[PDB]
């Protein structure tokens, strides 16, 4: 159902896409896994530990 | 033709203002006519400078009224709207008329 | 003797009445950083005068959102209470 | 909004007393700036006490972490809600989920 | 020595922000690096006009609220920041919104000047719900390059300016996606030559061929240090 | 007893910097090291930066 | 009556005008006597809030004033609570829309209004006169003034042979127009009389 | 790096 | 909106065939911008004779 519902969107079935490097403009090989994880920031801020 | 009469005591501030305002002429509209200037108003005061008495004791004051001629030959529907919310700075002024 | 709530903070200069009003307090909001005074509040007998005039802990900013008071029956200058 | 949820998200932002849930369901007057007032649909209302539910917006505040507690108002002015539905979203939730 | 030089041949406005342009016709080999180099000067360093200083009336903080509007004041600051603005002459310039009654308030409700262009006519600000509610907010527009925040420019600012007027940070850069395509160029006797497809997506205030163009003298300026000296 | 009581509430405005702590909801912990410019983001060919 | 005034002489080159604004013969008499009200009742309301100049500058029928003070928080009170209230009656004094801005004036140690009126409340609280200069000059030229010069005068320690009294530390060039001479004055209403202060305060030359 | 300032020396201002 | 150039502070000279360019300071994301555009120039494009 994850690869089907990647079919109902344009994307890559695998989940997958390649990916150019903002410095020298050129392809990563191999291609490498985006997506939207939910990341979350911890109260462990670092201005209230230095 | 809207000829613009700049009236202020400060040259360099009137300066600046004509330029603004021929920037917004110029972009919306097209041939302005120019800064010209005419010829400053140098009103003189002269005052005794003692409370009591000391006549030849005196200070000589002046106020230095410049004037900026803009004028703009075509107005467009565009440009002469422009001038409303286009207002210029403090100490400045304007006196724009259409024929 | 009783320790006080004035502007009128000593030794330190023109770098005490300033995030404040003429009687002494923070007088809310501003970009408050550390370093400085929100509440001069100083006793004499304690040239014997000191500085306890709750200040902003090192390293912080901030915005001043709200003042409470619940002060001792008279905080109140000639007339704000 | 978590795009992947679990769904589970509206009951721990419903139970957890952080969002403004309706009381009494009907319609909505929305002064807001202090307070959302719902006017109650005539079902759901008692025949005295005309009443109009006037609900508090607990505006920006010190939690015991020194986070900050706020609440913002999700209806609109005019606009149907329920009994049970969320008015204002709490911290940390997104129309009545939950959005850590 | 046989090399050739481009041109920018066609510049085709797909909408008012998403705009292509092509480059023709580009040596072999050298598509990738102007590409990537335009890309990089493109993203950093174009100069465009952002939201700086906010001043609402009858406001004594940003996280407060005010009567009779939707969004809090942190919203109007946010939606403030997202605001699109395209100033010609000056480099400083100060707008004004004023309206009452009871419907949402538009950027297309502010008071321009002349030389002062809002391109979002339906940027949405504040949602006034009491009829006898006003909101009277006076803006602040600087015009820069890259991003400078308010804790930055907590100290940086020089002019002694009154307390009351709150800080909104500035994102000037005005190029959001820069997308290239190195092609196969059309050529009717090389083919060994190809094209340069720049795909911009822009804040509606800068003007394609006019930023390649910036681009293009920032990039030739920073190598005549190679060029001149040694 | 307690004389002069007077509370005042600051609001500090933390954004994120090198050394704080972000994670997901899976376990995977981490402290954001380098908070990279725009360009240097590895793009996909749609030119979006992740 | 040698001396011309610093601020006066400067006027055209180093220093700027207060009062900022054009006017015609018809206007202009109606404009200073306005002027001179809201200034005269903004010293009277923001005596103990340390202010060193009121800018009142009006473009299209609409007051403009801007008080540079030295505590903000003090004339501002809560966040635009006395402020506000300042306004209407300025634009009462004044007949237009009122527009009040605040500039922080960054030490007001080097302020030379501010220093001659701290003198003078000074010396209306019976502090030795010569102390309280001393003070003002020391603390002038640790804040960075490249000079000062300060005089008192008449009535000093109750005295009934007036006379007067000047301290300068640095340089204080007056005949140097270039010069940014930031000039003024204050009187101490004492009980044996009037003391008149003086403060010169050299904060450096400008070049163009 | 002439070889680069050639190839741009076009659309310069 | 001024941009800083730089000074060319250092040749090293290791050998007559040898070289290092020291090269200070420019602003933040375009050293990588020049070297790579250097690079690839001088890779694949510089003309001479074998």
Same mark, same amino acid.
């Given at each position: 159902?994850?690869?089907?519902?990647?079919?109902?969107?344009?994307?890559?079935?695998?989940?997958?896409?390649?990916?150019?490097?903002?410095?020298?403009?050129?392809?990563?090989?191999?291609?490498?896994?985006?997506?939207?994880?939910?990341?979350?920031?911890?109260?462990?801020?670092?201005?209230?530990?230095? | 033709?809207?000829?613009?009469?700049?009236?202020?005591?400060?040259?360099?501030?009137?300066?600046?203002?004509?330029?603004?305002?021929?920037?917004?002429?110029?972009?919306?509209?097209?041939?302005?006519?120019?800064?010209?200037?005419?010829?400053?108003?140098?009103?003189?005061?002269?005052?005794?400078?003692?409370?009591?008495?000391?006549?030849?004791?005196?200070?000589?004051?002046?106020?230095?009224?410049?004037?900026?001629?803009?004028?703009?030959?075509?107005?467009?529907?565009?440009?002469?709207?422009?001038?409303?919310?286009?207002?210029?700075?403090?100490?400045?002024?304007?006196?724009?008329?259409?024929? | 003797?009783?320790?006080?709530?004035?502007?009128?903070?000593?030794?330190?200069?023109?770098?005490?009445?300033?995030?404040?009003?003429? $009687?002494?307090?923070?007088?809310?909001?501003?970009?408050?950083?550390?370093?400085?005074?929100?509440?001069?509040?100083?006793?004499?007998?304690?040239?014997?005068?000191?500085? $306890? $005039?709750?200040?902003?802990?090192?390293?912080? $900013?901030?915005?001043?959102?709200?003042?409470?008071?619940?002060?001792?029956?008279?905080?109140?200058?000639?007339?704000?209470? | 909004?978590?795009?992947?949820?679990?769904?589970?998200?509206?009951?721990?932002?419903?139970?957890?007393?952080?969002?403004?849930?309706?009381?009494?369901?009907?319609?909505?007057?929305?002064?807001?700036?202090?307070?959302?007032?719902?006017?109650?649909?005539?079902?759901?209302?008692?025949?005295?006490?005309?009443?109009?539910?006037?609900?508090?917006?607990?505006?920006?505040?010190?939690?015991?972490?020194?986070?900050?507690?706020?609440?913002?108002?999700?209806?609109?002015?005019?606009?149907?809600?329920?009994?049970?539905?969320?008015?204002?979203?709490?911290?940390?939730?997104?129309?009545?989920?939950?959005?850590? | 020595?046989?090399?050739?030089?481009?041109?920018?041949?066609?510049?085709?406005?797909?909408?008012?922000?998403?705009?292509?342009?092509?480059?023709?016709?580009?040596?072999?080999?050298?598509?990738?690096?102007?590409?990537?180099?335009?890309?990089?000067?493109?993203?950093?360093?174009?100069?465009?006009?952002?939201?700086?200083?906010?001043?609402?009336?009858?406001?004594?903080?940003?996280?407060?609220?005010?009567?009779?509007?939707?969004?809090?004041?942190?919203?109007?600051?946010?939606?403030?920041?997202?605001?699109?603005?395209?100033?010609?002459?000056?480099?400083?310039?100060?707008?004004?919104?004023?309206?009452?009654?009871?419907?949402?308030?538009? +950027? +297309?409700?502010?008071?321009?000047?002349?030389?002062?262009?809002?391109?979002?006519?339906?940027?949405?600000?504040?949602?006034?719900?009491?009829?006898?509610?006003?909101?009277?907010?006076?803006?602040?527009?600087?015009?820069?390059?890259?991003?400078?925040?308010?804790?930055?420019?907590?100290?940086?600012?020089?002019?002694?300016?009154?307390?009351?007027?709150?800080?909104?940070?500035?994102?000037?850069?005005?190029?959001?996606?820069?997308?290239?395509?190195?092609?196969?160029?059309?050529?009717?006797?090389?083919?060994?030559?190809?094209?340069?497809?720049?795909?911009?997506?822009?804040?509606?205030?800068?003007?394609?061929?006019?930023?390649?163009?910036?681009? +293009?003298?920032?990039?030739?300026?920073?190598?005549?240090?190679?060029?001149?000296?040694? | 007893?307690?004389?002069?009581?007077?509370?005042?509430?600051?609001?500090?405005?933390?954004?994120?910097?090198?050394?704080?702590?972000?994670?997901?909801?899976?376990?995977?912990?981490?402290?954001?090291?380098?908070?990279?410019?725009?360009?240097?983001?590895?793009?996909?060919?749609?030119?979006?930066?992740? | 009556?040698?001396?011309?005034?610093?601020?006066?002489?400067?006027?055209?080159?180093?220093?700027?005008?207060?009062?900022?604004?054009?006017?015609?013969?018809?206007?202009?008499?109606?404009?200073?006597?306005?002027?001179?009200?809201?200034?005269?009742?903004?010293?009277?309301?923001?005596?103990?809030?340390?202010?060193?100049?009121?800018?009142?500058?009006?473009?299209?029928?609409?007051?403009?004033?801007?008080?540079?003070?030295?505590?903000?928080?003090?004339?501002?009170?809560?966040?635009?609570?006395?402020?506000?209230?300042?306004?209407?009656?300025?634009?009462?004094?004044?007949?237009?829309?009122?527009?009040?801005?605040?500039?922080?004036?960054?030490?007001?140690?080097?302020?030379?209004?501010?220093?001659?009126?701290?003198?003078?409340?000074?010396?209306?609280?019976?502090?030795?006169?010569?102390?309280?200069?001393?003070?003002?000059?020391?603390?002038?030229?640790?804040?960075?003034?490249?000079?000062?010069?300060?005089?008192?005068?008449?009535?000093?320690?109750?005295?009934?042979?007036?006379?007067?009294?000047?301290?300068?530390?640095?340089?204080?060039?007056?005949?140097?127009?270039?010069?940014?001479?930031?000039?003024?004055?204050?009187?101490?209403?004492?009980?044996?009389?009037?003391?008149?202060?003086?403060?010169?305060?050299?904060?450096?030359?400008?070049?163009?």
């Amino acid at each position: 159902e994850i690869k089907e519902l990647l079919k109902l969107g344009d994307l890559p079935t695998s989940g997958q896409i390649r990916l150019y490097d903002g410095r020298t403009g050129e392809q990563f090989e191999r291609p490498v896994t985006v997506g939207y994880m939910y990341m979350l920031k911890l109260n462990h801020l670092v201005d209230d530990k230095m | 033709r809207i000829r613009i009469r700049l009236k202020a005591f400060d040259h360099r501030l009137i300066d600046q203002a004509t330029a603004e305002i021929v920037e917004t002429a110029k972009r919306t509209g097209a041939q302005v006519r120019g800064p010209i200037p005419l010829p400053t108003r140098k009103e003189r005061f002269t005052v005794l400078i003692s409370p009591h008495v000391n006549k030849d004791a005196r200070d000589q004051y002046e106020i230095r009224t410049h004037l900026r001629l803009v004028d703009i030959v075509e107005p467009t529907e565009k440009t002469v709207d422009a001038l409303m919310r286009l207002d210029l700075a403090a100490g400045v002024d304007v006196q724009i008329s259409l024929g | 003797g009783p320790e006080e709530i004035t502007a009128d903070i000593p030794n330190v200069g023109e770098a005490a009445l300033s995030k404040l009003d003429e $009687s002494g307090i923070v007088y809310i909001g501003a970009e408050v950083t550390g370093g400085d005074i929100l509440v001069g509040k100083v006793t004499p007998k304690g040239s014997d005068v000191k500085d $306890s $005039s709750l200040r902003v802990p090192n390293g912080v $900013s901030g915005t001043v959102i709200d003042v409470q008071v619940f002060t001792r029956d008279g905080v109140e200058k000639d007339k704000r209470a | 909004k978590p795009l992947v949820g679990t769904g589970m998200e509206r009951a721990v932002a419903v139970d957890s007393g952080v969002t403004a849930v309706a009381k009494r369901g009907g319609v909505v007057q929305y002064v807001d700036a202090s307070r959302i007032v719902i006017k109650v649909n005539e079902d759901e209302m008692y025949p005295g006490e005309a009443g109009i539910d006037i609900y508090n917006l607990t505006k920006y505040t010190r939690s015991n972490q020194n986070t900050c507690i706020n609440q913002m108002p999700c209806v609109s002015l005019g606009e149907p809600v329920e009994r049970g539905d969320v008015l204002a979203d709490g911290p940390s939730t997104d129309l009545g989920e939950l959005a850590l | 020595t046989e090399f050739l030089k481009p041109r920018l041949v066609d510049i085709e406005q797909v909408s008012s922000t998403h705009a292509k342009v092509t480059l023709e016709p580009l040596e072999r080999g050298f598509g990738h690096t102007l590409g990537n180099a335009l890309r990089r000067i493109l993203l950093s360093s174009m100069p465009g006009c952002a939201v700086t200083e906010v001043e609402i009336d009858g406001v004594l903080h940003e996280y407060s609220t005010k009567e009779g509007v939707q969004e809090d004041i942190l919203e109007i600051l946010l939606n403030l920041k997202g605001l699109a603005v395209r100033v010609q002459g000056k480099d400083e310039v100060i707008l004004t919104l004023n309206k009452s009654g009871i419907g949402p308030v538009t +950027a +297309a409700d502010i008071t321009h000047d002349g030389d002062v262009e809002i391109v979002k006519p339906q940027h949405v600000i504040c949602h006034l719900t009491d009829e006898n509610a006003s909101i009277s907010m006076r803006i602040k527009v600087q015009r820069g390059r890259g991003y400078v925040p308010a804790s930055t420019r907590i100290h940086s600012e020089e002019d002694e300016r009154p307390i009351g007027r709150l800080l909104v940070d500035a994102c000037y850069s005005p190029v959001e996606r820069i997308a290239y395509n190195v092609e196969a160029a059309r050529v009717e006797q090389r083919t060994d030559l190809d094209k340069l497809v720049i795909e911009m997506e822009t804040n509606g205030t800068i003007d394609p061929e006019e930023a390649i163009r910036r681009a +293009a003298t920032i990039l030739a300026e920073q190598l005549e240090a190679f060029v001149d000296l040694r | 007893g307690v004389l002069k009581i007077v509370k005042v509430y600051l609001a500090v405005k933390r954004r994120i910097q090198p050394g704080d702590k972000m994670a997901g909801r899976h376990g995977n912990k981490g402290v954001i090291s380098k908070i990279n410019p725009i360009e240097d983001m590895p793009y996909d060919e749609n030119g979006t930066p992740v | 009556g040698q001396k011309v005034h610093p601020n006066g002489i400067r006027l055209g080159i180093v220093k700027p005008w207060n009062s900022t604004w054009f006017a015609n013969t018809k206007e202009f008499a109606d404009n200073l006597d306005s002027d001179f009200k809201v200034r005269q009742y903004l010293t009277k309301e923001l005596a103990k809030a340390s202010v060193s100049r009121i800018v009142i500058e009006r473009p299209a029928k609409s007051i403009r004033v801007t008080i540079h003070t030295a505590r903000p928080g003090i004339v501002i009170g809560k966040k635009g609570e006395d402020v506000e209230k300042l306004r209407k009656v300025v634009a009462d004094i004044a007949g237009v829309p009122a527009q009040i801005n605040i500039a922080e004036v960054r030490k007001p140690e080097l302020d030379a209004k501010l220093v001659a009126d701290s003198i003078t409340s000074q010396l209306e609280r019976r502090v030795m006169f010569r102390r309280a200069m001393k003070r003002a000059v020391q603390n002038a030229m640790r804040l960075g003034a490249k000079g000062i010069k300060v005089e008192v005068s008449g009535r000093l320690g109750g005295a009934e042979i007036a006379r007067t009294e000047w301290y300068r530390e640095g340089r204080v060039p007056l005949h140097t127009l270039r010069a940014d001479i930031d000039y003024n004055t204050s009187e101490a209403h004492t009980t044996y009389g009037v003391i008149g202060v003086k403060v010169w305060i050299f904060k450096g030359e400008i070049l163009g």
